[PDB]
Write a protein that binds this DNA or RNA. Sequence first.
DNA 1: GCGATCGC
DNA 2: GCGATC
DNA 3: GCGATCGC
DNA 4: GCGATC
Lengths: 253, 253
Amino acid sequence: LKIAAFNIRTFGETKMSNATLASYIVRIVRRYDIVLIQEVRDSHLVAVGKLLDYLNQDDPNTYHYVVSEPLGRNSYKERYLFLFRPNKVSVLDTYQYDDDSFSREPAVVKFSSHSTKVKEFAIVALHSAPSDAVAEINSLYDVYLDVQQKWHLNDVMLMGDFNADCSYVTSSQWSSIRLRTSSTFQWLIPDSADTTATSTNCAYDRIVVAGSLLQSSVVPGSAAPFDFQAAYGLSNEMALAISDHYPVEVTLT
Amino acid sequence: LKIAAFNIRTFGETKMSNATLASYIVRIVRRYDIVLIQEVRDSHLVAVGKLLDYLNQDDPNTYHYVVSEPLGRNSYKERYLFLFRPNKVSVLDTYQYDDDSFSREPAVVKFSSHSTKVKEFAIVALHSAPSDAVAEINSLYDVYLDVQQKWHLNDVMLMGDFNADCSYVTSSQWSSIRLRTSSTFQWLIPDSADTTATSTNCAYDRIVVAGSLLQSSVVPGSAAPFDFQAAYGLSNEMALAISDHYPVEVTLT
DNA sequence: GCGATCGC
DNA sequence: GCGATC
DNA sequence: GCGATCGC
DNA sequence: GCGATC
Ligand SMILES: *[C@@H]1O[C@H](CO)[C@H](O)[C@H](O)[C@H]1NC(C)=O
Ligand SMILES: *[C@@H]1O[C@H](CO)[C@H](O)[C@H](O)[C@H]1NC(C)=O
């Protein structure tokens, strides 16, 4: 099973209405069984509708989805969108963590997976606020505890664009982040990875796993950023038109 | 007499050490009798030394100067530098306004001018904080009153990079700015001027005059931004390497 | 400092 | 058009 | 979100 | 290397 987290810069009607752009997004999305799409700025779900239409052109149930409400303290809101192949996994339950620790309160989905060692697991999504990256990543530790009590599940994948490097999270701040220091979690995407399509070299996008079953289901060395620029022979300009971030992915067995 | 205010993006040792860059700065500076240079990030005055050396290669007294101390609340400091031709004008007095209304407290120079209608006038320099543009421009009204009481002088020129347009000062904020609403002042650079070398079209840099004598000394239509890119046949890249702003200038008679 | 979209 | 973001 | 220098 | 800016 292939899972990815993808920050698609300002995913909305404008990008989904460009046929060239749409085609590349569709291509990327089709690589995965489960894909978290962040930065969905689509109050009426018109862009999301268009995407599913493309994905479901040959079989109406190729992909299904779960979408959060528009999240944000002020006028700037984003949804978390989970795309999944219904023949591979099912959604057992979902929940919106709500506390005010986060700009975009984490969306949590409990999945059933027939084809892998782990049979049931949750995914916690987070597109952190660049400005409050340290505190938010640190707050995810409490979300993990929450999920654990709510569903009696230890097998949890924490994923998204954490802004977890470069100017947002410096080297001296790591020690104050419980999600990082705790031995309960395994960070699949290392600090040395480059998850940006831009000129920077930053490990913004992360994949964090907790639980013995989930940890043992991970295929060694499968976790990495997917450089779509290199894969598809695009120019930097074309790559940036799709997104400023690369998806981060992992394979489960 | 020709007076200008020029924000030279990060004026410092790096820019002054590039001979091509230095040459263009020198060319620009030589157009004027009095020139306010902002964004001087030169704690030891090495860049300022180099500039004067160029300017004074043929006659040791071609240009003289007055420099403020490094100004700023925190670690980011800038000096205000006034370059003047000593055969044209003299410095009678200077003063550092100090209150905490400003990020970079205005430097004030009182000049003597033999060749023009106005014989004595002050120049108030301000490189406002982009973020607190409205309040700072509004605070200049109080500085004007200050100068007026200190020296019994009504002939005052307020100049610099006020960040007075586009996202920093919007249309609905103008009415709260006393320097703008008061009939005491004449705004020489209009809102329709473009003072940036970048792609934006903004009237950031301004020239404001108070006092009857000074107002009547102004040559009608002489006040404008000096587009050095167009003047010297530079590429956009070369122009931006010099500065992101154009000098604003005026002629007095 | 810059540039972009959304959602009014 | 422009504010709140990334 | 990005990129630049200074001044440690 | 990195924080405080523009
Ligand atoms: C799609 O976006 C790209 C990359 O930004 C193009 O430049 C193209 O202009 C857009 N769409 C067109 C009209 O088909
Ligand atoms: C001067 O700066 C320019 C413009 O940015 C050049 O690209 C040039 O590389 C610099 N100086 C050189 C070494 O002489």
